[PDB]
């Protein structure tokens, strides 16, 4: 099972999240990003279990990411299932901030305000490498 | 002396052109991008000097990437300098297409229209290891 599941807001954070798994695969960390380990049947039973079964959550914050979070309280957006599975097994949650605007808690679902109490790492475009040795510091 | 110049527009290209970086660094290839090789002195100068060193010349178009090339008739854009540079020395121009709208020829200065002439290739999110493959290809 992989260590490590990438939640990402595709329209925003596709390139990053591309990133991250190449970098975490050379590290030696098994990673899940759906685009390569999400396969066949109903993919929201395969998406819970996959945020399940890995130790740490890794969740990239595009510009926007939780836009479409707000507001969501039926819990119907992706990420916003992701981070409640995530913080209600108690994972490692990991913060990736790309130009991400941090929101007030009063604008998210109750069930996601708590993503707001983990830290989290800045990426750096200018000194990458360092970035990647931060979040690698950062998994277990 | 690096054999791929990887030009990019950096508000909106950053994370691709970083990606190709690891990608094409992983396979082999010597790489030129700014924020890895850029070093000391007048940057003008070495801008110019690296993209006519790399035989490859990887061009990230990403959404509205030829934006500040429109009307640059002085020529004081820096992707409009760097592919002005490739074409004067008939680079192996490859155009890295994601999300990009192919502009018509006339609104970009004339002495880059001709980037238009060169085959690309499409950035599949999808298919990553297909698309660095069919790059790779591409490469000399
Ligand atoms: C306030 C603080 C500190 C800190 C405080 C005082 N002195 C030293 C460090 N460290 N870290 C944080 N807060 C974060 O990192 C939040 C990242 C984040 C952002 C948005 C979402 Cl939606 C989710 C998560
Ligand atoms: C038209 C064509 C064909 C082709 C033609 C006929 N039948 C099969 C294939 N193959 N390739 C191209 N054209 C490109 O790929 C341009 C990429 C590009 C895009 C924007 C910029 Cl600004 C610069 C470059």
């Given at each position: 099972t992989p260590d490590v599941f990438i939640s990402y807001r595709?329209?925003?954070?596709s390139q990053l999240a591309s990133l991250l798994k190449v970098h975490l695969q050379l590290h030696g960390f098994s990673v899940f990003i759906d685009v390569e380990k999400?396969?066949?049947?109903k993919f929201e039973d395969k998406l819970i279990q996959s945020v399940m079964g890995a130790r740490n959550f890794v969740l990239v914050l595009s510009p926007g990411a939780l836009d479409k979070c707000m507001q969501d309280h039926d819990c119907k957006d992706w990420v916003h299932k992701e981070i409640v599975t995530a913080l209600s097994c108690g994972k490692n949650i990991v913060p990736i901030i790309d130009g991400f605007e941090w929101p007030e808690p009063?604008?998210?679902?109750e069930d996601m305000q708590?993503?707001?109490t983990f830290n989290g790492i800045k990426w750096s475009h200018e000194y990458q490498e360092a970035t990647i040795e931060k979040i690698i510091r950062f998994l277990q």
């Open positions: 595709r329209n925003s954070g999400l396969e066949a049947g009063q604008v998210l679902p708590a993503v707001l």
